[PDB]
Amino acid sequence: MATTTLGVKLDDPTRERLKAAAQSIDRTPHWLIKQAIFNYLEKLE
Amino acid sequence: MATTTLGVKLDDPTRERLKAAAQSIDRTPHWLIKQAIFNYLEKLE
């Protein structure tokens, strides 16, 4: 997908919590970040 | 905040849509990304 790489603002502590978000679908952390950002749009869309 | 900088996976088209998310609180795009990721945790928290 048109994934342009921008610097994100995540904290180690927070980054671990994202793993839980990845666990919801069972995907990779970096890859989870894309859902957490784009899926976040689809959620509140 | 402990904002560690990781490369994100955003698309220009998608990045513009984030601006709408920033418009919800009226904040800065980069800065919106942190909410879109952390607020996304607080939302589904």
From CA B44, how far away is CA A10, in angstroms rounded? 17
Q: What CATH number is attached to the domain comprising A22?
A: 1.10.1220.10
Q: Would residue A18 count as lying in a domain? A: yes
* Interface check A23 vs B, CB under 8 A: no
Kindly state the DSSP code that residue A4 receives in the 8-state scheme. B
The domain of B42 spans 11-45
The answer to whether the beta carbons of residues A22 and A29 sit under 8 Å apart is yes
Q: Would residue A5 count as lying in a domain? A: no
- Structure method: NMR
From CA B29, how far away is CA B32, in angstroms rounded? 5
Under an 8 A CB cutoff, do A38 and B14 touch?
Answer: yes
Full DSSP string of B10-38: B-HHHHHHHHHHHHHHT--HHHHHHIIII
Tokens of A30: 């970096």
Q: Would residue B5 count as lying in a domain? A: no
* Interface check B22 vs A, CB under 8 A: no
Q: Which of B1, B2, B33 is the closest to A37 by Cβ?
A: B33
Total domains, chain A: 1
Kindly state the DSSP code that residue B4 receives in the 8-state scheme. B
Q: Would residue B43 count as lying in a domain? A: yes
The answer to whether the beta carbons of residues B37 and A10 sit under 8 Å apart is yes
Q: Would you call A13 exposed, middle or buried from its count of C-beta atoms within 10 A (0-12, 13-18, 19+)?
A: exposed
Question: Which residues lie closer than 8 Å to A39 by C-beta, 6 or more apart?
Answer: B40
